[PDB]
Amino acid sequence: FPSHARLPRAGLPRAEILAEIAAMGAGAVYDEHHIAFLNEVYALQSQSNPLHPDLWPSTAKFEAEVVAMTAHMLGGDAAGGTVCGTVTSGGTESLLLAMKTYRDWARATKGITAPEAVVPVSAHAAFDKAAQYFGIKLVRTPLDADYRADVAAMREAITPNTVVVAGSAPGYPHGVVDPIPEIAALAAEHGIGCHVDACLGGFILPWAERLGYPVPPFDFRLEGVTSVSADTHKYGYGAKGTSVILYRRPDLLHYQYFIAADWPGGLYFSPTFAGSRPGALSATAWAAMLSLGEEGYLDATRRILQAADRLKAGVRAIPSLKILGDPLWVIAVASDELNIYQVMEEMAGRGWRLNGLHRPPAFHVALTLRHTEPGVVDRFLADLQDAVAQVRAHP
Amino acid sequence: KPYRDRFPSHARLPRAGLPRAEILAEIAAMGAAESPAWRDGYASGAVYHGDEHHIAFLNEVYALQSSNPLHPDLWPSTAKFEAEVVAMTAHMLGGDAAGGTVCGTVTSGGTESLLLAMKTYRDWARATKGITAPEAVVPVSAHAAFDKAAQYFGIKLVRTPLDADYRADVAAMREAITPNTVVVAGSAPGYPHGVVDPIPEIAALAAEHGIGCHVDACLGGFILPWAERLGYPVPPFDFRLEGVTSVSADTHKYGYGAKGTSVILYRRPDLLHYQYFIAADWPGGLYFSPTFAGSRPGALSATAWAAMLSLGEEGYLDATRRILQAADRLKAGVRAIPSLKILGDPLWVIAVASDELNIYQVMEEMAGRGWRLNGLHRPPAFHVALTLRHTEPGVVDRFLADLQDAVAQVRAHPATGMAPVYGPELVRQVLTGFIDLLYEV
Ligand SMILES: [Cl-]
């Protein structure tokens, strides 16, 4: 296709443009008719922009309802109605905002000016961003034998300047859920924040729980948990570019808000990083949640977890492959025997786009509704078994 | 919160899962109440194109790229869109003058652009100048997002005074720069009054001190180059100036791309790199992100690429012609009305105030007649961000008419409504409760 290094003089046929885009189109994605549906939602809300709520009160509603429903899904009632929050643009914005908030909260509240934060080494890399961005010393603690945060190590690391601790539910690298309860307990005992990163697990964990699978309380059921983030786009099945950050009580949330009084451009407030932003995306989340409902999520996470079971089984049924920790649907597989990167590469050749991890070396499969399709997991295992045979005879 | 009673509120997930039809119906229903406002040119800014078929077009684009760039290996299509959008924008802003070194990134809005630049200048200056108490010098008119960056990234923000015609006072700026100043900025134009700052002397001030010069062209980015080409008076404001080290332009505003998309440009790669974030020894693998966001809606980038290609230089020319011509007509009518006054000499974004009357009341009367325009303060005035939507027939004529009636009113009644409100910490105490009411269920 023609490359454009500079604006066309003329202006091209909309048809021609649409053709090229379609031509190219001919984890990552978390169904034909569902997508079709969200796309039509978007279309209806295309012009939306939550910065001007006076013009789009429709969006201001969507956002509020999405936050509400999510909070309730994460034990918001346990907090006794004080739980609040905001729709962000992704897990990262959620993570950044929280970190920023805890910083601001702690300066105002504790006089802390050299903020420090304690997260498991497994904690999402976005934590390091926040750290550099907002000038917070980030202290990453070690994991334990089953790749969960070592809480003792965490306890040792907290300091009079620590403003918050975090745990992942689950973490991206290995897909295990951290000891959220003892972490949130550590938190409370020191009077510092506890943030749960449930960006990945936010919309599957509550139903896995309800479903008989082993998951520790990880949300607002715990007094210590002061904030938790969950991604409505990934497993919430909302359209990409949308997420949620929740706080136990309003006093925290307010530290996240930005307000400017004497700007000649008028009064200025923004709840998030963004100023103007795509209300349309919020619509897709609201729509996706309502279309699914508790039943919808239950069924989806059932299918996913069941596939994961099947898959984990097949995998473990190769003595040369090892699963890191005991993940539920996000799986990290490594080899003490072989060059896992090669196994991953062979697999890549056979058409799989899976994520390579390191420290330790392993690739990971973020199981998705897309894998609950028939023979999919069966295909995976088959290709995997052939890939290992290869590497065995070609180190 | 008008639909409180019109539509069921959801405080918690439905047990069942609702008909997609029913859902779509409610959303469309709200859209039916809402479209006219912006579609019928009653809105200051908000919607910048608003044309039925153009929107329809971008919507179909979105649908096709329905796709994020954090996984470029899966969506190299997007990685292209973003690169081409940056390229075309840079060229439109004098990128060639910089001699091919101009680079940049697609962000999610003018704000992200502004934040990123500020962050970059901070990081650049620490690494390069050892500056650890960064300070930044912007005109008081400079967008409020500058204050955000300041609090976010721990940069002392110094706002300098404007001159009689509401342009940055460069002398004041010169006086304010310090061994710790990492960057100065100017707006092309600013949001409050829509005037373009003395970018040339500012960018000169910058170079002479070896500090950054950022031009905020979020608003003017996609109209100024064509207004220039069109015979209207606009100073060089982009990379044509050696001193300008970075400039931001919003493809979603007057670029006519779909909402949620923008561009930040740097004169040379060495600056851009300070914006990038990279994490090596995360067990989750190698991690890089060019912007604030990790995962970002590639679909939106597509809509910008598509919007730019569909328009082309001809497209922008025509559009800005129409807009500027309306603005002329409008400014004329306004200046003819005693006793109002236009602040500075804006081209399409207009700030009108009254030394004679309570402008907020004039704004409120106007509001009653159906106009959604932005109330400014310090000084008091409302502003009209002219848009393709106002280039429609009798629109400006409607505006002037309603305006003239609104002034007659206030003349004989010096006065309530939403006016009382618009009239320092109580503000934060209040605006916060407001943000809470918004999110209330
Ligand atoms: Cl706007």
Structure-token match 């649908």, residue found = B63
Helices (H), ranges, A203-333: 205-209, 250-256, 279-316
To the nearest whole angstrom, how far is the Cα of A92 from the nearest Cα of chain B? 6
Q: Which amino acid does the sequence have at B182?
A: V
- Give me the count of residues in chain B: 441
Strand runs (DSSP E) across A222-281, as ranges? 227-230, 243-247, 258-260, 268-270
- Give me the count of residues in chain A: 395
- Rounded to an integer, what distance in angstroms lies between the CA atom of residue B287 and that of residue B70? 10
Which residue on chain B is closest to A231 by alpha carbon? B295
Choose one of B266, B296, B312: the last residue of a domain: B312
Q: Measured between alpha carbons, how far is residue B348 from residues A23, A210, B131, B205, B240 in Å?
A: 39, 58, 39, 28, 23
Ramachandran bin of B60, using left for φ above 0, alpha for ψ from -120 to 50, beta for the remaining angles: alpha
Which residue on chain B is closest to A356 by alpha carbon? B285
In eight-state DSSP terms, residue B161 is P
Do B298 and B397 lie in one domain? The reply is no
- Rounded to an integer, what distance in angstroms lies between the CA atom of residue B291 and that of residue B112? 8
Pairing outcome for strands B277-279 and B349-353: unpaired
- Rounded to an integer, what distance in angstroms lies between the CA atom of residue A351 and that of residue B197? 55
Structure tokens that stand for A391 in this block = 């590497």
Please indicate, yes or no, if residue A159 is contained in any of the structural domains: yes
- Rounded to an integer, what distance in angstroms lies between the CA atom of residue A120 and that of residue A179? 11
Contact across the interface for B17 and A134, Cβ inside 8 Å:
no
Mention every residue, 6+ apart, whose C-beta is less than 8 A from residue B21. Answer: none
**Environment class of A287 (CB within 10 Å of its CB; exposed 0-12, middle 13-18, buried 19+):** buried
The half-sphere exposure of B62 on its side-chain side, counting CA atoms within 13 A, is 32
Please indicate, yes or no, if residue A2 is contained in any of the structural domains: no
Q: How many domains does chain B have?
A: 3
Contact A9, B313 (CB under 8 A): yes
- Of A43, A133, A258, nearest to B59 by CB-CB distance is A43
Contact across the interface for A121 and B260, Cβ inside 8 Å:
no
Which contacts of A210-213 are long-range, i.e. CB under 8 A and separated by 24 or more positions?
A: A210/A298, A211/A298, A211/A301, A211/A302, A211/A305, A213/A305, A213/A328
Cα-Cα-Cα-Cα dihedral sign, residues B24, B27, B32, B36: negative
Q: Measured between alpha carbons, how far is residue B12 from residues A64, A238, A282, A294, B290 in Å?
A: 11, 16, 16, 10, 36
Choose one of A243, A276, A293: the last residue of a domain: A293
Nearest to A9 by CA among B309, B303, B80: B309
Do A224 and A326 lie in one domain? The reply is no
Q: Three-state SS for A229?
A: strand
Contact A99, A117 (CB under 8 A): yes
Structure-token match 């006076």, residue found = A54
Choose one of A244, A264, A293: the last residue of a domain: A293
Tell me, yes or no, if B106 comes closer than 8 A to chain A by beta carbon: no
Q: Three-state SS for A222?
A: coil
Please indicate, yes or no, if residue A168 is contained in any of the structural domains: yes
Do A247 and A143 lie in one domain? The reply is yes
Q: Which of A32, A273, A352 to mutate to test the interface with B (most CBs of B within 10 A)?
A: A273
Helices (H), ranges, B130-176: 145-153, 170-176
Tell me, yes or no, if B163 comes closer than 8 A to chain A by beta carbon: no
- Rounded to an integer, what distance in angstroms lies between the CA atom of residue A290 and that of residue B7? 14
| DSSP line for B172-204 | HHHHH--TTEEEEEEETT-TTT-PPP-HHHHHH
Do A210 and A193 lie in one domain? The reply is yes
Tell me, yes or no, if A105 comes closer than 8 A to chain B by beta carbon: no
Range of the structural domain that residue A219 is part of: 31-293
Do A119 and A258 lie in one domain? The reply is yes
SS3 content of chain A, % helix, strand, coil (to 5): 45, 15, 40
Do A155 and A254 lie in one domain? The reply is yes
Do A200 and A329 lie in one domain? The reply is no
Instruction: Give me the phi and psi of B290, to 5 degrees please.
Output: -70, -30
Question: What CATH number is attached to the domain comprising A232?
Answer: 3.40.640.10
Structure tokens that stand for B437 in this block = 């009411």
Tell me, yes or no, if A52 comes closer than 8 A to chain B by beta carbon: yes
Contact across the interface for B2 and A57, Cβ inside 8 Å:
yes
Contact A140, A117 (CB under 8 A): no
Q: Give me the residues near ligand 1 (ion), CB cutoff below 5 Å.
A: A 276; B 45
**Environment class of A172 (CB within 10 Å of its CB; exposed 0-12, middle 13-18, buried 19+):** buried
Please indicate, yes or no, if residue A1 is contained in any of the structural domains: no
Contact across the interface for A258 and B148, Cβ inside 8 Å:
yes
Do A61 and A191 lie in one domain? The reply is yes
How far, rounded to the nearest angstrom, does the alpha carbon of residue A160 sit from its chain's CA centroid? Answer: 29
Structure-token match 């503000």, residue found = B427
Cα-Cα-Cα-Cα dihedral sign, residues A208, A209, A211, A213: positive
Question: What CATH number is attached to the domain comprising B10?
Answer: 6.10.140.2150
Nearest to B284 by CA among A197, A92, A356, A173: A173
How far, rounded to the nearest angstrom, does the alpha carbon of residue B308 sit from its chain's CA centroid? Answer: 17
Q: Which amino acid does the sequence have at A217?
A: P
Tell me, yes or no, if B355 comes closer than 8 A to chain A by beta carbon: no
| DSSP line for B7-66 | S---SS--SS---HHHHHHHHHHHHHHHHHHHHTT-BSSS-S---HHHHHHHHHHHHHT-
CB < 8 Å to B263, chain A: none
Q: Three-state SS for A243?
A: strand
Q: Which amino acid does the sequence have at B282?
A: W
Tell me, yes or no, if B308 comes closer than 8 A to chain A by beta carbon: yes
Please indicate, yes or no, if residue A5 is contained in any of the structural domains: no
Structure tokens that stand for B131 in this block = 């500056």
Which residue on chain B is closest to A93 by alpha carbon? B293
Contact across the interface for A359 and B281, Cβ inside 8 Å:
yes
Do B282 and B319 lie in one domain? The reply is no
Do A140 and A277 lie in one domain? The reply is yes
Do B227 and B317 lie in one domain? The reply is no
**Environment class of B225 (CB within 10 Å of its CB; exposed 0-12, middle 13-18, buried 19+):** buried
Work out the number of other CB atoms within 10 angstroms of the CB of residue A174.
28
Tell me, yes or no, if A356 comes closer than 8 A to chain B by beta carbon: yes
- Rounded to an integer, what distance in angstroms lies between the CA atom of residue A68 and that of residue A90? 17
Question: What CATH number is attached to the domain comprising A387?
Answer: 3.90.1150.10
B300 CA to middle of ligand 1, Å? Answer: 16
Q: Measured between alpha carbons, how far is residue B84 from residues B74, B304, B337 in Å?
A: 18, 10, 46
Contact across the interface for A134 and B153, Cβ inside 8 Å:
yes
Please indicate, yes or no, if residue A247 is contained in any of the structural domains: yes
- Of B46, B74, B293, nearest to A92 by CB-CB distance is B293
- Of A281, A291, A358, nearest to B285 by CB-CB distance is A358
To the nearest whole angstrom, how far is the Cα of B284 from the nearest Cα of chain A? 4
Please indicate, yes or no, if residue A327 is contained in any of the structural domains: yes
Structure-token match 């597989």, residue found = A333
Range 10-49 of B in CB contact (< 8 A) with A: 10-20, 23-24, 27-28, 30-31, 34-35, 37-38, 43, 45-47
- Resolution, Å (one decimal): 3.0
How were these coordinates obtained?
Answer: X-ray
Ramachandran bin of A288, using left for φ above 0, alpha for ψ from -120 to 50, beta for the remaining angles: alpha
Please indicate, yes or no, if residue A275 is contained in any of the structural domains: yes
Which contacts of B152-155 are long-range, i.e. CB under 8 A and separated by 24 or more positions?
A: B152/A100, B152/A133, B152/A134, B152/B115, B152/B119, B153/A133, B153/A134, B153/A135, B153/B115, B153/B118, B153/B119, B153/B122, B154/A134, B154/A135, B154/B122, B155/B118, B155/B122, B155/B182
Structure-token match 């392993």, residue found = A362
In eight-state DSSP terms, residue A338 is S
Do A182 and A268 lie in one domain? The reply is yes
Which contacts of A388-391 are long-range, i.e. CB under 8 A and separated by 24 or more positions?
A: A388/A318, A388/A320, A388/A321, A388/A335, A388/A338, A388/A343, A390/A342, A390/A346, A391/A338, A391/A339, A391/A342, A391/A343, A391/A346
Range 386-415 of B in CB contact (< 8 A) with A: none
Contact A347, A282 (CB under 8 A): no
C-alpha Rg value of chain A to the nearest Å: 22
- Rounded to an integer, what distance in angstroms lies between the CA atom of residue B383 and that of residue B8? 36
The continuous run of DSSP H or E covering B82 comes out as helix B76-92
- Rounded to an integer, what distance in angstroms lies between the CA atom of residue B235 and that of residue B201? 10
- Rounded to an integer, what distance in angstroms lies between the CA atom of residue B104 and that of residue B265? 4
Nearest to B123 by CA among A135, A215, A18: A135
Q: Three-state SS for B279?
A: strand
Q: Measured between alpha carbons, how far is residue B297 from residues A56, A281, B262 in Å?
A: 21, 9, 13
Instruction: Give me the phi and psi of B355, to 5 degrees please.
Output: -75, -15
- Rounded to an integer, what distance in angstroms lies between the CA atom of residue B32 and that of residue B47? 16
